[PDB]
Amino acid sequence: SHRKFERPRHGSLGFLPRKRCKRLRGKIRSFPKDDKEKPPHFTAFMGYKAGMTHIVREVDKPGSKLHKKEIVEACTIIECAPMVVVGIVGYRETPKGLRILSTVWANHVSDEFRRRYYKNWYKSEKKAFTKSLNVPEATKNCLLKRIEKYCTVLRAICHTQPSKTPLRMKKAHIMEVQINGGSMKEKLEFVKEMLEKNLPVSTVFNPNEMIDVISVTKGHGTKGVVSRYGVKRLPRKTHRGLRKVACIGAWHPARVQFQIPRHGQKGYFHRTERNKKIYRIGLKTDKNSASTDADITEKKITPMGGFPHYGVVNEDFLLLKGCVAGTKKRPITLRKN
Amino acid sequence: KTIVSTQKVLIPEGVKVAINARKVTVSGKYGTLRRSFRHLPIDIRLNKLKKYIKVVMWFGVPDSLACIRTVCTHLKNMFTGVTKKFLYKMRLVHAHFPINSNIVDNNTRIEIRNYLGEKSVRFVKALPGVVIEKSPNVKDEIYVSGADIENVSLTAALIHQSVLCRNKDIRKFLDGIYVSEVTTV
Amino acid sequence: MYKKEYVIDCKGHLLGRLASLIAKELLNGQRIVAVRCEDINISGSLYRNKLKYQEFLRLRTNTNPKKGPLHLREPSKILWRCVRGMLPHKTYKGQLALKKLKVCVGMPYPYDKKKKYVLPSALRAFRLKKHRRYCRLGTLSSRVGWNYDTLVKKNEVLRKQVSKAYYKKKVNNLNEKKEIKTEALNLINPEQRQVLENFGY
RNA sequence: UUGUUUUCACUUUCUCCCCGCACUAAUGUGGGGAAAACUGGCUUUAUUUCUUCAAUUAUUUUUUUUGCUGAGGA
RNA sequence: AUUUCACUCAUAUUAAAUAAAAUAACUCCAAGUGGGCCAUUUUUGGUAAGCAGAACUGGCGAUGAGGGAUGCUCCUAACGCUUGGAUAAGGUGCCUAAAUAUUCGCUCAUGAGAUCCCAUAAAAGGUGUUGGUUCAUAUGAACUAGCCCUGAAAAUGGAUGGCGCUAAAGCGGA
RNA sequence: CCUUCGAUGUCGGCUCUUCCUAUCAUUGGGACGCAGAAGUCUCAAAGUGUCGGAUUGUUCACCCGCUAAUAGGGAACGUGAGCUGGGUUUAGACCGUCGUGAGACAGGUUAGUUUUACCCUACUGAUGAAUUUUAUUAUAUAUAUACAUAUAGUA
RNA sequence: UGCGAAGCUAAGUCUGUUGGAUAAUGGCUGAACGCCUCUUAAGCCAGAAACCAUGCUGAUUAAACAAUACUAUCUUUUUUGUUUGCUAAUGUAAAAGAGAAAUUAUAUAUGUACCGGUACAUAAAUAAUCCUAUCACCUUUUUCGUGAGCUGAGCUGUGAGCUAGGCAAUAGUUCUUUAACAACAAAAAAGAGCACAAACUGUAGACGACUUU
Numbered sequence A: 001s002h003r004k005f006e007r008p009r010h011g012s013l014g015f016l017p018r019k020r021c022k023r024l025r026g027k028i029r030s031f032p033k034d035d036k037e038k039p040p041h042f043t044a045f046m047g048y049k050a051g052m053t054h055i056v057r058e059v060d061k062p063g064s065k066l067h068k069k070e071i072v073e074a075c076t077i078i079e080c081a082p083m084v085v086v087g088i089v090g091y092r093e094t095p096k097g098l099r100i101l102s103t104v105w106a107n108h109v110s111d112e113f114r115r116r117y118y119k120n121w122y123k124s125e126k127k128a129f130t131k132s133l134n135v136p137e138a139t140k141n142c143l144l145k146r147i148e149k150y151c152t153v154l155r156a157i158c159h160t161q162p163s164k165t166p167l168r169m170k171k172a173h174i175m176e177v178q179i180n181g182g183s184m185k186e187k188l189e190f191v192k193e194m195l196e197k198n199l200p201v202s203t204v205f206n207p208n209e210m211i212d213v214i215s216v217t218k219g220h221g222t223k224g225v226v227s228r229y230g231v232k233r234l235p236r237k238t239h240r241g242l243r244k245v246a247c248i249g250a251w252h253p254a255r256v257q258f259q260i261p262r263h264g265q266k267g268y269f270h271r272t273e274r275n276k277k278i279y280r281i282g283l284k285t286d287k288n289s290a291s292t293d294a295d296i297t298e299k300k301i302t303p304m305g306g307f308p309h310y311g312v313v314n315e316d317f318l319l320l321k322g323c324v325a326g327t328k329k330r331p332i333t334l335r336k337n
Numbered sequence B: 001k002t003i004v005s006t007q008k009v010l011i012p013e014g015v016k017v018a019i020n021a022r023k024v025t026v027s028g029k030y031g032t033l034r035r036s037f038r039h040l041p042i043d044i045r046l047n048k049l050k051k052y053i054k055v056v057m058w059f060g061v062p063d064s065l066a067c068i069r070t071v072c073t074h075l076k077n078m079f080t081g082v083t084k085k086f087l088y089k090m091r092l093v094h095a096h097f098p099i100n101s102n103i104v105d106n107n108t109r110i111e112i113r114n115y116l117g118e119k120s121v122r123f124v125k126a127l128p129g130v131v132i133e134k135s136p137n138v139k140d141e142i143y144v145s146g147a148d149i150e151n152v153s154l155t156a157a158l159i160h161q162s163v164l165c166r167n168k169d170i171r172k173f174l175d176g177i178y179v180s181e182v183t184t185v
Numbered sequence C: 001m002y003k004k005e006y007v008i009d010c011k012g013h014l015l016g017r018l019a020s021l022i023a024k025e026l027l028n029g030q031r032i033v034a035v036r037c038e039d040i041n042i043s044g045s046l047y048r049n050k051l052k053y054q055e056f057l058r059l060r061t062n063t064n065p066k067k068g069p070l071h072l073r074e075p076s077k078i079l080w081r082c083v084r085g086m087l088p089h090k091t092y093k094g095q096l097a098l099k100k101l102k103v104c105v106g107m108p109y110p111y112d113k114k115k116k117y118v119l120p121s122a123l124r125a126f127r128l129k130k131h132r133r134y135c136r137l138g139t140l141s142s143r144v145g146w147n148y149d150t151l152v153k154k155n156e157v158l159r160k161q162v163s164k165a166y167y168k169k170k171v172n173n174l175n176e177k178k179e180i181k182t183e184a185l186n187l188i189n190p191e192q193r194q195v196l197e198n199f200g201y
Numbered sequence D: 001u002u003g004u005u006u007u008c009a010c011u012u013u014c015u016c017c018c019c020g021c022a023c024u025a026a027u028g029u030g031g032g033g034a035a036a037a038c039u040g041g042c043u044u045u046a047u048u049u050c051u052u053c054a055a056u057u058a059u060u061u062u063u064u065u066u067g068c069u070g071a072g073g074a
Numbered sequence E: 001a002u003u004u005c006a007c008u009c010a011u012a013u014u015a016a017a018u019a020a021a022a023u024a025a026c027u028c029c030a031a032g033u034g035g036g037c038c039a040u041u042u043u044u045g046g047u048a049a050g051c052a053g054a055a056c057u058g059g060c061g062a063u064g065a066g067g068g069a070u071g072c073u074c075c076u077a078a079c080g081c082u083u084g085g086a087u088a089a090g091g092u093g094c095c096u097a098a099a100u101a102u103u104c105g106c107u108c109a110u111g112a113g114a115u116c117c118c119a120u121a122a123a124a125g126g127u128g129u130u131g132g133u134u135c136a137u138a139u140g141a142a143c144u145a146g147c148c149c150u151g152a153a154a155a156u157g158g159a160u161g162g163c164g165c166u167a168a169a170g171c172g173g174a
Numbered sequence F: 001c002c003u004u005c006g007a008u009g010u011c012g013g014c015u016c017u018u019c020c021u022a023u024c025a026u027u028g029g030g031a032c033g034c035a036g037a038a039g040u041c042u043c044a045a046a047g048u049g050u051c052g053g054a055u056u057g058u059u060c061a062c063c064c065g066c067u068a069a070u071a072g073g074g075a076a077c078g079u080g081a082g083c084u085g086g087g088u089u090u091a092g093a094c095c096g097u098c099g100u101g102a103g104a105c106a107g108g109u110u111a112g113u114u115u116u117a118c119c120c121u122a123c124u125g126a127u128g129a130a131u132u133u134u135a136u137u138a139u140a141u142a143u144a145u146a147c148a149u150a151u152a153g154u155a
Numbered sequence G: 001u002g003c004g005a006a007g008c009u010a011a012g013u014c015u016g017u018u019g020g021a022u023a024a025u026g027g028c029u030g031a032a033c034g035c036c037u038c039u040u041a042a043g044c045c046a047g048a049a050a051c052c053a054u055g056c057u058g059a060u061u062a063a064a065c066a067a068u069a070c071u072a073u074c075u076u077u078u079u080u081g082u083u084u085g086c087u088a089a090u091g092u093a094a095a096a097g098a099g100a101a102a103u104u105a106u107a108u109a110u111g112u113a114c115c116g117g118u119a120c121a122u123a124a125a126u127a128a129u130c131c132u133a134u135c136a137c138c139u140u141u142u143u144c145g146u147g148a149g150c151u152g153a154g155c156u157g158u159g160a161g162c163u164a165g166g167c168a169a170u171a172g173u174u175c176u177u178u179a180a181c182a183a184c185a186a187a188a189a190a191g192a193g194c195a196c197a198a199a200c201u202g203u204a205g206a207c208g209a210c211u212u213u
Helices: A111-115 A137-150 A184-190 B065-083 B149-158 C015-028 C046-057 C075-084 C092-099 C137-143 C149-185 C190-198
Strands: A044-051 A054-057 A071-079 A083-094 A097-105 A153-159 A174-180 A209-216 A219-223 A264-267 A270-281 A318-321 A332-336 B004-009 B016-018 B025-027 B043-045 B053-058 B086-092 B100-103 B110-113 B130-134 B141-146 B177-184 C006-009 C032-035 C101-103
Touching: A044 A174, A083 A137, A083 A174, A097 A137, A097 A153, A137 A184, B004 B065, B053 B065, B065 B149, B086 B149, B100 B130, B130 B149, B141 B149, C006 C015, C015 C032, C015 C075, C015 C092, C046 C137, C075 C101, C075 C137, C092 C101, C137 C149
Parallel strands: C006 C032, C032 C101
Antiparallel strands: A044 A071, A044 A332, A054 A071, A071 A318, A083 A097, A083 A153, A153 A174, A209 A270, A209 A332, A219 A264, A270 A318, B004 B053, B016 B025, B043 B053, B086 B141, B086 B177, B100 B110, B130 B141
16 A cells, blocks of 8 residues: 655665776766857866865845855865877767777876786786887878768877875876867867877866766765665664664565665766856965965965875865865866766 | 549649649749659649640548648649739738838848837848738838749738747737738739 | 668568568578668657657566666667567577668668668558658657757768769760660671661660 | 330540630540441341350360379178 | 967168267266356346356366467367377467568558457548439539548556567558 | 464554546647636646645535645555554543443443564665676778677776 | 763764756758648758766676786697596588678769869679689709799799600599598697785775785
């Protein structure tokens, strides 16, 4: 029979299965779309976990009860050790998805990037990307002509440099960042300049725009139902313990449904936070970017007392609303909206 | 029930046509004609020195013989519509708030305001090549016209349903944007 | 039936009749490759077939939808499943017959210039009243969530131009072959000429 | 409380005429009239292989190509 | 009334027909059984029931085989081991052997319909189709009945058996 | 009384999930005996939500409130190797009525042991090989090829 | 007794979109019957927290796949074969010409040249078609094309052909016509690095696994 007191279920089925994520970096399912009218520029970025902090502000929303009065908010400041752009990948649409036409590497590559292709770097001969970077430019010209004639999605392999960060890790995280904008004829020339240099964030990131955050949440191992889905605790009189779901399904169907909350792994999931507007642009070396002309004190992005389980921060900064997922030292990925 | 149906459509003097595989291409005065009538089984006989069209339907059963009549009177009627433009009698109505018109961009993308006092945006288009523009004689009247019969008539059709209000008895509140009569240039 | 493999252009073919014929060929052992499945047409209104596919879509195993009927949205996969429902796929011979079938949307690479065959027993022009209502499998699949109809259309129009070019080459090749034949006929001995003339060669 | 007998009204055409005079689906049509009848049927005469001699039933006689079977041992 | 003598009523097809009618008749000994159920037709109680209780016949039990997708009781048909032929019931679009056979109509369903038992459907609405009937001077009605539609809502996801089928692979014929 | 009496754990509550629509609210409409409000009838619609407490073992019920609404139901009257044991329904005991009596009471009351998962499957998570009669939406400088391709390890 | 770092935690903080056709709902034309008439005639539009997309989560849910980087004695041609548990070695779901490129419309379409039109051809049992097979050998006369090498061109080779000549099949009547493809073994000729473990880490964890050095 029916329940006498109908109440909403526990957890969301949209985040199933609640299993350990396969990787550590934040993958991107979807990049922001492109338009012919809009001009060819960048489409995403990446970095690390610099801070999810506060800032004091003043609302300009008409009729707001606070408005002119000073307020306190919650935004974030990003860690951007400049990423090295190393590769170019072309994709063409097919009825079986978008397929890789080809990838092209920079004629010179870093050691940190190449270290990722190994599991025992200290014992190898470091032979990766050794004789693959001595190709003639006739092949490059022919294949980029093919890219223009056939390819329709352009992505750039960029890798981070953990040497700048205090991380123990020496392998470089590699991802691909889409390039969005105009037609192929303009796009070919617009993708012929930045093919080797490192990536400054302030190149495209501008104030008053929306971005999203991709990461992998923390980890807690196996946890009970009361933690994984927040089920009601059974009364203290319960015989075989109280931290469990009482009924895991009716008599029929004669099976356990997949909607029943059960014990298992919680955390180490893939998470994306949407509607995160970027607000301000700054740097790393300069001394007054974060502060204002009404604050008239001295400070830079530098923190105090060190960062617990993160070391010190010696790289770029911007501003963006919200707080982030993951743990300390965890790679974070930044997308546009 | 018999085996032949046809309508000996009378071609007026001011029109010249050419039939080809239920795709008749015609020239009048304001422009040219063509039509996609491929849904219906139609055969056509044509002459041009003695004129008159003969649109026919073989094995004419009254199941679908009501369609040849529609297409035939329609055919003579686009002939008339392109030769002389058709004018329905559209009148805007306003019980309390006189209708605010914003005729932006030359008969294309008109805007409607001042209808019950919402004071918001309301814009309804029409098929290109058809005019629905203010008649200078009376402000609340718009002299609809255009190229062809369907061209004028769908424009006279879509406009009435654009500004409807809610919770107000239309037996007492006679608000609307009416269309009354039909004439020619 | 007896060819190494038969390539069928599914354009303008009724789904059920096409599936029945193809399944009979697979069971008899003839390998079949079906192309341009996104122009398969189904009798009945597009809304009717959309309702049917929605009823099929709402149907899944309650305990775990993973083992539920995999619905599939590509028209090629729809035709493949319709054919599978026509033959005993639960047995070894039926499984072999099912695996003897290839389905493609549009015309992929190794089907540019092998003769695409058409079975008149499943044509719309012969198996459907003109005044009655029909649908299009590509449109229905796009409605039920394929989002690849336009790409197939652009590939198809490019292929149309590409094939038209070499058809224009082939027609001139053939019309020069016929004219060299006309002159080579009179260089053959008369008694051999007579047999060709009276046998229409 | 039956039979019998009697009257007109019927058909061909690429026939023709006139009117709408081209209004035909056509190398014609809507209407009104004239023609013979090359339609047709009727009786004959030698012939049915120039040409039909059908179909069904009753009564007979063959024929093309081929599947399966070989019990027994007087 | 009985008995005995005479005569004699087809007896060479048989005191009407038909009959693997003596596979008869009789006697003895003895097993099991003695809860029945279902189908057509008839019928009692009950609002009704896959309910309870009866009659006839045939089945299930006690019995498989082909078919009705599926099924103790429905149709064909009852059974030694085989080889050929031809069929019954039922089918011939694929599953599945055999007709996308021929021929004539009807139907478009935004929950069509599709083999007895059988797996529900009613009152009330129908100027679509076709054919009627009656009436009033090619002119208007009324009905009538075939298909289709509304009436027509239930819980795991779902079932003309599935796929699917509309110039049917649907319905009624031939 | 068709299946279970060589046993399918018989009330309620708690917990938890899913499903139906004959929709309570929310969404968009039509009608009103609709001036507007407010409301009533009704359509498409199950996406979202349908509560806190007093009394009672209760379902049901009835009040106090909040709410936007506090809609109706199914899932072996969903759910006891999930719980609890308040009731019903062993044995003790009390009262009332009935009985000569032992005792009886869908009359009332009080106290009264709630067993086992380590098996299969299902579900939740966690490792993980093998995969040629197997796959191809290509590979070629306006030009050929399936009569081709495709080794395998690591990343 | 206090804070009680960090972690955990909430009772604390941040975040939680637009596109399509669409149900109900009004019109264009318009028959049926002279004409009117949303369609129990035809075609077209307006439009919902519902649907499918978008976005998000898995994807050993596809026993799936792509690109890239590096490496493992490796790759082509010929002959004979595959008639201690092993160390030569063979399997076909289908060869017997397994021959075949416009696209499209079905109440007629495809080309050609002009500006959807124009005029003209083509096509309408369309695969009921076309194309492809047997002339062996060797000798002579030579002709025309393609490849090695050679300087648009000479020679040789290859393919096809022309003139003339003389040269073979035989196993007793058939038991599949051993004829295809792919693979492998032997023998010749030519060219052609990593991962696990170990210690460390702790962004991870029941153990595996995962992140590192």
